[PDB]
Amino acid sequence: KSPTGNEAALKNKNFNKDVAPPQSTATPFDRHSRTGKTDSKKKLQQGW
Amino acid sequence: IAIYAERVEERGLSAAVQAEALKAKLLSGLPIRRAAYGVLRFAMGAGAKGVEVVISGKLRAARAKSQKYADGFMIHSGQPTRDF
Amino acid sequence: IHKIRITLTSTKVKQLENVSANIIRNAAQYNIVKKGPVRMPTKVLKITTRKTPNGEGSKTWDAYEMRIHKRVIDLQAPASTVKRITQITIEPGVDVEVTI
Amino acid sequence: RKKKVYTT
Amino acid sequence: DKAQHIVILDQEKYDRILKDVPTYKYVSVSVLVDRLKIGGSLARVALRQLEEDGIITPVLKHSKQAIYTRAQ
Amino acid sequence: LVVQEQGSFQHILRLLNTNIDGRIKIMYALTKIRGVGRRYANLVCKKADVELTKRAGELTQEELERIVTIMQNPTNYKIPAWFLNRQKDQVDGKDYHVLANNLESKLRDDLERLKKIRSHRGIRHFWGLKVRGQHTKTTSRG
Amino acid sequence: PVTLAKVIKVLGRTGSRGGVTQVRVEFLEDASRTIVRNVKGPVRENDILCLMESEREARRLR
Amino acid sequence: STQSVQTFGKKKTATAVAHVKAGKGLIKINGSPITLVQPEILRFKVYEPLTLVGLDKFQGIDIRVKVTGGGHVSQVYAIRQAIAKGLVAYHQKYVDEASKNELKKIFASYDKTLLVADSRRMEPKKFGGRGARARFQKSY
Amino acid sequence: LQVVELATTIPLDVQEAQREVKLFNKWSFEDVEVKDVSLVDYIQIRNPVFVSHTAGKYASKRFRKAQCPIVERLTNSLMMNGRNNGKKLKAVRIVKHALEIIHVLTEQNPIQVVVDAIVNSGAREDSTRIGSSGTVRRQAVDVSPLRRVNQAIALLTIGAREASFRNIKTIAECLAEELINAAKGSSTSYAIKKKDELERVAKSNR
Amino acid sequence: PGVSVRDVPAQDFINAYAQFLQRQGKLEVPGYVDIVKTSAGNDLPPQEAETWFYKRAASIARHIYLRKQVGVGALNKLYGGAKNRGFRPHKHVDASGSINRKCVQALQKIGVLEISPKGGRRISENGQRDLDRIAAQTLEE
Amino acid sequence: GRVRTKTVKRASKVLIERFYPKLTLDFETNKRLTSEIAVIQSKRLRNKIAGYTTHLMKRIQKGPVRGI
RNA sequence: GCGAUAACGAACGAGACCUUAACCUACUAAAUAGUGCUGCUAGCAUUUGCUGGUAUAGUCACUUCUUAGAGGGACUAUCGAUUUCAAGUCGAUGGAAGUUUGAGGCAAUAACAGGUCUGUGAUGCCCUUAGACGUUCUGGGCCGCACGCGCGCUACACUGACGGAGCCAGCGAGUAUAAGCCUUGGCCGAGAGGUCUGGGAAAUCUUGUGAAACUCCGUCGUGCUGGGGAUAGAGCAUUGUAAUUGUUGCUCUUCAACGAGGAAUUCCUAGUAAGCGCAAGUCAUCAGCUUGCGUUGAUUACGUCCCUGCCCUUUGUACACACCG
């Protein structure tokens, strides 16, 4: 069935036979930095 | 059209001119403490009742921080904030 | 003598009232019968935008405004007398249109 | 976000 | 599916209406539905006729409410 | 004024192979015929010269035939073509007004013809989903 | 057998949520035996509110 | 001219411009008799400035009102205000004050709004709710 | 008593109102007296009004509600359930026709029955709750006369409203029957079982 | 005294005029009065098909009397109503233009109405004649 | 509530402490008198200022006032 | 704020202030607002009365109502109480208004790893930069459906559905050589829609936006009924190059659950809640959405710390990147 339409006319919609999963939520320390390059006290002293 | 150029009466009293006047001084690498107070006493020289300059961003550091340099009297809320 | 109408429009009223006043004075010492000034119902120019440049936070709104006021003055005077009044009472805030 | 791969 | 109110007036309900209405303290569209089991539509046509024939004195007139009492 | 009768009421009717209750008013009773609504029945009841204040069982046999003919031959009694079910039909292009039994038959022809041409509109009918552009992400829960 | 009470002084709000007010009443008949009782509704002075039972004082509600 | 007074009575939005002259007891609503003023239920609201002191006070005056704006009830309330406000003003300008003051006693002791216009207006709607006080329901 | 002639003719029926102000010009308030001493100062029958429609300001101060006419206060309890809020003229039509029904029954004054149905439907003792933040506890306290007149009016209109749900009987005669039965202490009516039930639980909490 | 249309109650005046304008018979009636709907927001035909056009034209004729040179476009808006949009909110819809165009045309060539300057349709010389006559033959009973 | 602020309390009481004789137990004359003594930018503020001024005089008449 | 006081006197924030709503027969004027007179005219009774139209020359007067500009007006005013007699509060009287007069705008000291580089020719760094991740144009998508949740609209009928008759608001928007605005009035079309004119660059005209609830009169008669309009078919138009995955509407037909909602939980104290409509926005078309406006218009409190949240004080600390320690 090279054209995309031929399958759709004959294929069955078996969606109400399978039960949906009971839970489907799929979308942590914000204060802790992950950059890995701390600010030196000389950089603060020279900058500010 | 006819365009004429006039010099401002009070440079310190005008918050416009001193803003770009600060901009030129900032670009020359001067330390912020020397630059920030260099205009504040000029506004206080002009007799302006108050002046506050805020510099925020980065200077030789990754983390962004703010420094506010207030002086003199301040009004903050209400209709006069648009007039004065 | 000519049936002539003059309209004054501006955004600020102290400028608008000043132009309205002294023209009327120009028709007081000059014995030209006067109709006006007619204070048109003020038109408030409003647009309601969103404070948040992005779409996060509380649902809060910015309601800016412009107030535009109209004054129409009716004149029975020659075209020379009506024209010279406007250039005497010219001031940047108000545009001056004269219609016969 | 996708590496553009060609055919032609 | 309990109403089953009669919409066509047959002979046995004809004289029963004309015999029970006189012995009523106060009638209405629903009152005839409540005790004579006739339909609300049949109640209106039955009441609006009895007023002309002298059985009923019109207390008040309204489209949504018909307040009637005995004329005897 | 209220009148009386005996034996002249017809409780159960058989119009167009479909039952009609006799206790209900005739103009809305005809709506029980598939392909016949309140709007269409009101036009034919007056075309059949039947006053709207009568029940279905009140009517005579002649009026019952007078009803079905105007039902079955609408364009023949000054009923507008735009007042019909299927004007400019698929095959003959003429104005028809379908009735109780013949509707789902020509609808199946409408479905089979649209399925035979394997268009998008026909295919979705086979799947059983909403055809007219309705969203089904959160509302298709029946 | 109901007895009536005339309120004479508003003490203050009692109860958990403060919706009931302690009030001092006076007997219309036999103007003695003053009793502190609770009232749910809004009370001004000189309310002739009645009492089903009078032989019970009222205190703070929790 | 004659004993003519012009005034206005107001409710929420409806304002009734009433003219009271000297003549026969003509009481008109936009050129229509008062006995048919709609709605029928509130027809006696307009009758209140009449029957409170009596129809006799109107024998020497003719009243024609022009009420615009507002709603069905508001136009009724603005008219019944204009009749009382027009009548009370009329006795001030062409009759003694004691009768003018006397009408102010029966009218005011029966309805405060008969001589005093209400100050209530619709409160502006605030963002965040489909009303002035109400807000969008919050979901956690 | 004389008929007064106007250029705009005034019908005779309204001309009866000069001698006495009457409710809908059909019922007078002078033959009505309230059978409860405590509710005298909080029931307002002194000022006659043609219609139970004043459009005044009773929500400004605290006790201004006791000065609103009882007919207006009764009608203000009808327009509920969302679909009726703000439909006062409809509510007046519901009550005005109801009063006529209340008259042809027992031939009494309709507003006298209104008074009779109020003093008997105002709950006199209610058991407040003293639960300690979640747990269930009940304690009986008294009811102010202001809270008695209104709780009568508030509860009375509900009984007719439910009697007119899925019922061919219209609300006006449902309100008419609701007022007449409650007047004579009819335990079969609504707001009478509830009044006894609300008082009975207080007898089990004191 | 002089009785006019404005001295008559609005509801009962039409119940008498519509009978007269019906009995007069000179008012021409289009053939689709028994088929079509008055308002696009309406869902059912008028329940009195035998007299709706006469009952309507009586209301329209007296409505012309009360105002000045009101056209057919304004007539549709006044007679339109709130459409019973299924799940969407009710909205105001203008009524049928053809009937109100025929209602004025039916009344225009009968002498009651005619074309007014600067738009609209003003009442005629004989339009005020019979309308105040109908008022005289309305309230006397 | 209708509690006066300090800017209306202290401004008013200075007026008594400087112009006690010419004030009077009546608002309107005090309202006009305070309109000429002190420069007030807003008429609402002056009506606030003058109101406390008379009320203080009502207190001075009925006894010795504290702080004036 | 009073009051107590090792503190005294101040500043920011609050309040003041500004915008809007309510008062003004007291000023200033208004043919782009109205009225009354006066003409000219029309109807009905003939009483000289009552209702319209017309008068950008009737070469009339006025601003009460309509508009706005200068102001005044309220300051808890007077009086009873309560209280430290103080700050205040509660009841009355007058008043347009005696809840901060009503509603909002603005709004402190530092800050948050709250959100946005998907608004900027605002940017630092990393990537690409000609087979471009720039751009353009084609066809498709964000709508896609076994599912859990939220903001809502219809509704579950009779205070109601329709079908007639009554017929009243307020905020606003608008074009020229364009690439098409509001679009009247007339003429066709059942409708949607179609045609021909004009006005308005704007208190003029669109528009009195003659809106719906609502009022009255009848049909229906508790029935999943004529309460409800989901699913689905056919035909008729408009929008746009282009409507198929139906833009949107209309006509007929199709007559779905829903017969008042468990556990929970939300908003709200006066023109407020709740109903009821209209406008501006995103727009070539599309509003069950917001932002505003207006119609009708309530029940009950005017109290408390019982739940929750926050603030303040005392207290404890081995925390200060500060308990996500």
Curated annotation (Swiss-Prot), chain C:
Highest taxon above the source species: Eukaryota
Record keyword Flavoprotein present: no
Keywords: Cytoplasm, Ribonucleoprotein, Ribosomal protein
Ribonucleoprotein keyword on record: yes
GO cellular component, one term: yeast-form cell wall
Compartments in which it is found: Cytoplasm
Example GO BP: translation
Molecular function in Gene Ontology: RNA binding; structural constituent of ribosome
Family, per entry: Belongs to the universal ribosomal protein uS10 family.
Record function comment: Component of the ribosome, a large ribonucleoprotein complex responsible for the synthesis of proteins in the cell. The small ribosomal subunit (SSU) binds messenger RNAs (mRNAs) and translates the encoded message by selecting cognate aminoacyl-transfer RNA (tRNA) molecules. The large subunit (LSU) contains the ribosomal catalytic site termed the peptidyl transferase center (PTC), which catalyzes the formation of peptide bonds, thereby polymerizing the amino acids delivered by tRNAs into a polypeptide chain.
Quaternary structure and interacting proteins, as annotated: Component of the small ribosomal subunit. Mature ribosomes consist of a small (40S) and a large (60S) subunit. The 40S subunit contains about 32 different proteins and 1 molecule of RNA (18S). The 60S subunit contains 45 different proteins and 3 molecules of RNA (25S, 5.8S and 5S).
UniProt protein name: Small ribosomal subunit protein uS10
Gene, per the UniProt record: RPS20
Shown chain mapped onto the complete sequence: 18 to 117 of 119
From Swiss-Prot, chain D:
Listed transmembrane segments: none
Chain's role: Component of the ribosome, a large ribonucleoprotein complex responsible for the synthesis of proteins in the cell. The small ribosomal subunit (SSU) binds messenger RNAs (mRNAs) and translates the encoded message by selecting cognate aminoacyl-transfer RNA (tRNA) molecules. The large subunit (LSU) contains the ribosomal catalytic site termed the peptidyl transferase center (PTC), which catalyzes the formation of peptide bonds, thereby polymerizing the amino acids delivered by tRNAs into a polypeptide chain.
Complex formation: Component of the small ribosomal subunit. Mature ribosomes consist of a small (40S) and a large (60S) subunit. The 40S subunit contains about 32 different proteins and 1 molecule of RNA (18S). The 60S subunit contains 45 different proteins and 3 molecules of RNA (25S, 5.8S and 5S).
Name of the featured protein: Small ribosomal subunit protein eS31
Organism this protein belongs to: Candida albicans (strain SC5314 / ATCC MYA-2876)
Upper classification of the organism: Eukaryota, Fungi, Dikarya, Ascomycota, Saccharomycotina
Parent-protein residues present: 80 to 87 of 151
From Swiss-Prot, chain H:
The keyword Cytoplasm belongs to this UniProt entry's keyword annotation: yes
Cross-referenced InterPro entries: Ribosomal_Su5_D2-typ_SF, Ribosomal_uS9, Ribosomal_uS9_CS, Ribsml_uS5_D2-typ_fold_subgr
Main location: cytoplasm
GO molecular function, one term: structural constituent of ribosome
Database matches in Gene3D superfamilies: 3.30.230.10
UniProt superkingdom: Eukaryota
GO cellular component: cytosolic small ribosomal subunit
Localization (cell): Cytoplasm
The keyword Electron transport is annotated on this UniProt entry: no
Keywords, alphabetical: Cytoplasm, Ribonucleoprotein, Ribosomal protein
One GO-annotated biological process of the protein: translation
Entry function: Component of the ribosome, a large ribonucleoprotein complex responsible for the synthesis of proteins in the cell. The small ribosomal subunit (SSU) binds messenger RNAs (mRNAs) and translates the encoded message by selecting cognate aminoacyl-transfer RNA (tRNA) molecules. The large subunit (LSU) contains the ribosomal catalytic site termed the peptidyl transferase center (PTC), which catalyzes the formation of peptide bonds, thereby polymerizing the amino acids delivered by tRNAs into a polypeptide chain.
Stored NCBIfam families: PRK00474.1
Similarity comment: Belongs to the universal ribosomal protein uS9 family.
Known partners and oligomeric status: Component of the small ribosomal subunit. Mature ribosomes consist of a small (40S) and a large (60S) subunit. The 40S subunit contains about 32 different proteins and 1 molecule of RNA (18S). The 60S subunit contains 45 different proteins and 3 molecules of RNA (25S, 5.8S and 5S).
UniProt-recorded name of the protein: Small ribosomal subunit protein uS9
Organism: Candida albicans (strain SC5314 / ATCC MYA-2876)
Gene name for this UniProt entry: RPS16A
From Swiss-Prot, chain J:
InterPro entries linked: Ribosomal_eS19, WH-like_DNA-bd_sf, WH_DNA-bd_sf
Keywords, comma-separated and alphabetical: Cytoplasm, Ribonucleoprotein, Ribosomal protein
Main localization of the protein described in the UniProt heading: cytoplasm
Membership in a protein family: Belongs to the eukaryotic ribosomal protein eS19 family.
Region (Disordered): 119-141
Compositional bias of kind Basic and acidic residues: 122-133
PANTHER family: 40S RIBOSOMAL PROTEIN S19
Molecular function GO terms recorded: RNA binding; structural constituent of ribosome
Keyword Ribosomal protein belongs to the record: yes
Subunit-structure text: Component of the small ribosomal subunit. Mature ribosomes consist of a small (40S) and a large (60S) subunit. The 40S subunit contains about 32 different proteins and 1 molecule of RNA (18S). The 60S subunit contains 45 different proteins and 3 molecules of RNA (25S, 5.8S and 5S).
Cell compartments where the protein resides: Cytoplasm
Originating species: Candida albicans (strain SC5314 / ATCC MYA-2876)
Stated role: Component of the ribosome, a large ribonucleoprotein complex responsible for the synthesis of proteins in the cell. The small ribosomal subunit (SSU) binds messenger RNAs (mRNAs) and translates the encoded message by selecting cognate aminoacyl-transfer RNA (tRNA) molecules. The large subunit (LSU) contains the ribosomal catalytic site termed the peptidyl transferase center (PTC), which catalyzes the formation of peptide bonds, thereby polymerizing the amino acids delivered by tRNAs into a polypeptide chain.
Any one annotated GO CC term: cytosolic small ribosomal subunit
Protein name (record): Small ribosomal subunit protein eS19
